[PDB]
Design an enzyme around this catalytic site. Structure first.
Site, mmCIF file in Angstrom:
data_model
loop_
_atom_site.group_PDB
_atom_site.id
_atom_site.type_symbol
_atom_site.label_atom_id
_atom_site.label_comp_id
_atom_site.label_asym_id
_atom_site.label_seq_id
_atom_site.Cartn_x
_atom_site.Cartn_y
_atom_site.Cartn_z
ATOM 1 N N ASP A 152 0.731 -1.269 0.000
ATOM 2 C CA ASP A 152 0.000 0.000 0.000
ATOM 3 C C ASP A 152 0.762 1.323 0.000
ATOM 4 O O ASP A 152 0.756 2.047 -0.995
ATOM 5 C CB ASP A 152 -0.991 0.021 1.174
ATOM 6 N N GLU A 362 1.296 -8.050 12.152
ATOM 7 C CA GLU A 362 1.347 -7.718 10.732
ATOM 8 C C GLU A 362 2.760 -7.393 10.270
ATOM 9 O O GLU A 362 3.228 -7.922 9.257
ATOM 10 C CB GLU A 362 0.420 -6.543 10.438
#
Length: 389
Positions: A152, A362
């Site tokens: 992203d 994550e």
């Protein structure tokens, strides 16, 4: 212990046939994540491993062949009527995973049936990728949205994102939305979008993962005696393409900005991925090893998502510095393939160390090792399992 907890994370995130990327999220399936998660399930239940992918293809693939980066099931799914899905894709690592499942499934009958069922669907996805994202047959595909890179907010996308005319429980977007609105306006015509999108990038990560997948799709085709005709073409052209991304002066692989018509001079962890595709020659891989070693002189845990000495480096900001387990894995695999055993061992050691201390997160701060982002992150747990199989 890591493995037992890892299995606990997967079960908890399990929604029948698919697994959510992390705890607390809605029942939606992700393309990239589900591929990695499938490897994790091989350590628990092979049928469940296969189902993860069958679910992804059955409920997410359209007649055009595209696999959306997200399938909005909004519900649990039973083992192998059509849910909504996103309109973009993500890293095509799936073929590499399917080859593994096919080759290692102890049940040979099941393996043949699952691989034969998925092969054409895999073929269709790769075909869509090239026909829609590489119309000029250059051998390289472009992403039309930074999200498609699966990374992203990578600093590499900063400039490209700039020209765009205006998953997580813990609470730019203006531009991400603009692109989607544009795709909408163009009623998602592949031809039109590729030609008009203000964001068109040749992502080195996306392409390296795709070239590795092409290579594995080919192997699968031969083993199953399927026609490899189309795959062969993608491999040959892809080999020329990925290697063209190498910047001799900088000694690194960069993504290219086709809107600007120039290389994006930003060194990120994705630039190591061609090692995973297997295209560089030994000399090039050693220059990469030397670079990874340089990064290790400024960060405690190996493989920050961006050069620690980069002005865009930020220790705990998503893809702008933090360490990611799936990237550590792919890069380690690649370095091992080129004979850099110690470097590959370090990447694994740091990965396991982080998860042992912080649990399945994550991403992690490379300087302090602090866990960040989602909790009970699925492919960190899955890779912890697959990593130590």
């Amino acid at each position: 212990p890591l493995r037992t907890k890892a299995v606990e994370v997967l079960q908890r995130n399990s929604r029948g046939a698919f697994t959510v990327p992390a705890h607390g999220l809605y029942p939606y399936q992700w393309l990239w994540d589900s591929a990695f998660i499938a490897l994790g399930w091989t350590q628990v239940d092979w049928e469940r491993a296969w189902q993860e992918l069958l679910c992804l293809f059955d409920y997410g693939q359209g007649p055009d062949g595209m696999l959306p980066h997200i399938v909005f099931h909004e519900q649990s799914r039973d083992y192998f009527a059509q849910p909504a899905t996103s309109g973009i894709t993500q890293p095509p690592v799936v073929a590499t995973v399917v080859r593994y499942l096919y080759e290692k499934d102890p049940d040979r009958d099941r393996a043949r049936e699952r691989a034969r069922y998925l092969f054409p669907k895999l073929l269709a996805f790769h075909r869509w990728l090239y026909h829609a994202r590489d119309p000029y047959r250059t051998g390289l595909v472009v992403i039309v949205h930074p999200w498609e890179s699966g990374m992203d907010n990578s600093p590499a996308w900063d400039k490209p994102l700039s020209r765009v005319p205006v998953k997580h429980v813990n609470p730019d977007y203006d531009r991400y939305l603009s692109l989607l609105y544009l795709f909408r306006r163009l009623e998602y015509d592949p031809r039109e979008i590729y030609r008009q999108s203000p964001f068109k990038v040749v992502d080195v990560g996306f392409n390296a993962i795709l070239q590795r997948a092409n290579r594995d799709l080919y192997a699968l085709a031969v083993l199953l005696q399927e026609d490899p005709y189309e795959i062969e073409e993608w491999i040959v052209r892809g080999e020329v393409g990925l290697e063209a991304l190498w910047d001799r002066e900088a000694g690194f692989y960069f993504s290219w900005d086709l809107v600007a018509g120039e290389p994006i001079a930003v060194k990120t962890s994705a630039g190591f991925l061609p090692l995973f595709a297997g295209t560089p020659h030994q000399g090039r891989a050693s220059l990469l090893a030397q670079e990874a070693e340089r990064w290790g002189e400024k960060a405690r845990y190996l493989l920050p998502s961006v050069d620690p000495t980069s002005p865009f480096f930020e220790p705990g900001r998503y893809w702008r510095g933090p360490v990611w387990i799936n990237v550590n894995w792919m890069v380690a695999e690649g370095f091992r393939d080129y004979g850099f055993a110690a470097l590959a061992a370090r990447l694994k050691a740091d990965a396991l160390a982080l998860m042992e201390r912080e649990g399945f997160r994550e991403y992690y701060d490379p300087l302090t090792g602090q866990g960040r982002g989602g909790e009970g992150f699925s492919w960190s747990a899955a890779l912890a399992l697959f990593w130590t199989r």
